[PDB]
């Protein structure tokens with residue numbers, strides 16, 4: 001009910017749908033930058049040269065504590081890619097833990113389709129494990145450095161408030177950020193924050209697919225990915241069920257593919273015609289699962305208005321993927337997500353800031369009985 005972590009509350013911002021970032025100050029004297037909170041990768045990288053989309057950048061020559069690692073780094077993602085030089089410097093998070101650590105920093109000097117115009121962030125904070133760090137797992141991720149050099153508990157939690165702001169509690173959990181109970185799912189393996197989905201429902205209706213399909217390849221949590229990305233087959237079955245569940249109004253095919261937008265007169269969006277979506281996650285006890293349920297307010301994202309007009313345009317934010325399921329902002333904006341690294345688990349609870357209406361709310365409920373959940377994972 002109280003909050004010893006109060007100063008970290010509301011420490012995140014976003015330029016409405018383009019990424020949640022936190023201020024991080026690197027080097028000496030201080031150089032503060034807006035850094036994208038990303039749980040889908042493991043490199044701490046900051047723009048280090050002028051870019052059209054960058055208002056400011058890291059200037060290594062002005063930092064007396066900067067140390068060159070004399071090694072380059074290249075990082076390509078599903079979307080965008082960048083190249084930089086590796087080094088280390090002192091790093092603190094003003095509205096984060098009260099510590100300063102010497103961390104690895106990749107100075108971004110060149111990039112393609114990575115930075116986002118108007119997003120207001122100039123770097124990325126990869127919060128995932130060393131296994132997926134580039135060039136290799138010997139480049140210690142920022143959080144690993146934090147835990148090794150300080151006594152900050154090995155845990156962080158995220159509250160991404162959609163519509164843009166939120167909180168990144170480092171080293172603990174803050175009760176004012178969620179309601180109800182926290183339900184935990186095992187981190188299957190320490191590389192990406194991999195989890196296991198055992199069941200999927202649309203408006204309470206089971207999609208009825210072997211659970212292996214839901215995590216075909218893998219299922220991860222990535223705060224730096226906009227949508228709820230699903231394996232091809234799952235996406236197709238999900239779209240058909242959602243269409244059938246919202247038949248009171250027809251939409252062009254391109255809407256479901258994210259290629260077309262639909263706009264309603266300001267404040268008229270018929271949220272009620274769209275179904276809620278539930279993902280069941282492996283629990284912490286044998287044959288026990290729990291489910292998280294999002295509303296259309298989460299998977300139907302607002303598109304930067306033409307100029308504050310009377311037209312609310314939306315994009316269907318559930319898309320397909322060829323690299324497994326990716327639970328992005330669409331999922332996270334409905335909940336307070338606890339990345340309990342110490343106990344190799346991720347917790348979910350209803351967010352105190354998720355967008356909902358007077359009829360429905362996002363939810364986290366359990367427990368449920370689910371057999372053979374172990375088989376759901378891809379080997």
Ligand SMILES: C[C@@H](NC(=O)c1cc(C(=O)OC[C@@](N)(CO)Cc2ccccc2)cc(N(C)S(C)(=O)=O)c1)c1ccc(F)cc1
Pocket residue numbers: 017018019020036038039040041077078079080113114115124222223224225226227228229319328329
């Ligand atoms: C910041 C931005 N991310 C993207 O716009 C993005 C990134 C990646 C992606 O591949 O990201 C990989 C990465 N997250 C791994 O860590 C790195 C990354 C971060 C920022 C920009 C590009 C790539 C995939 C996709 N998709 C293909 S999508 C349309 O969502 O299906 C979108 C974003 C995140 C949270 C929000 F609330 C709104 C906007």
